[model samples]
Target: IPLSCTICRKRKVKCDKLRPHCQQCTKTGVAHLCHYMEQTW
Candidate 1:
């Protein structure tokens, strides 16, 4: 089950799919960002 965000896929890193902390963007101190984007139609 691939629950990783597109950003993580591009980076080729292991995505935890750790809701609210999923592997998406570079995490800074005291911050966990999500780069997952929803398809806009």
Candidate 2:
């Protein structure tokens, strides 16, 4: 499954949907900082 990193969601940017970190967050240099929250229902 794919999900957006916390930062990307907050900033409203497109996410590469990478695990541990997304490309958008990585390029912004916040990859190690944000948490990737998975959805469940």
Candidate 3:
């Protein structure tokens, strides 16, 4: 489903769609700045 945000998209990685933040964002310490686009819905 590729529901990750721009950060993960640019990294070409996967996401868990964990709402508020994904696994990758959390791992990289960017959860606070993580934001998904409208296309995700």
Candidates sorted by lDDT, best first: 3, 2, 1
lDDT of 2 by residue, 1-41 (tens): 46666787789787776776777777888977667666873
Off by over 4 Å in 2: none
Alpha carbon lDDT of residue 16, candidate 3?
68
Candidate with the larger TM-score of 1 and 2: 2
Superposed by TM-score, candidate 1 places the C-alpha of residue 35 at a distance from the truth, in angstroms, of 5.6
TM-scores for all predictions: 0.45, 0.59, 0.71
Q: On residues 1-41, what C-alpha lDDT tens digit does candidate 1 reach at each position? A: 54556656666777665656653454632224454555552
Better of 2 and 3 by TM-score: 3
Ranking by TM-score: 3, 2, 1
Error of 2 at 32 (Å): 1.4
Residue 14, candidate 1: Cα error in Å is 0.4
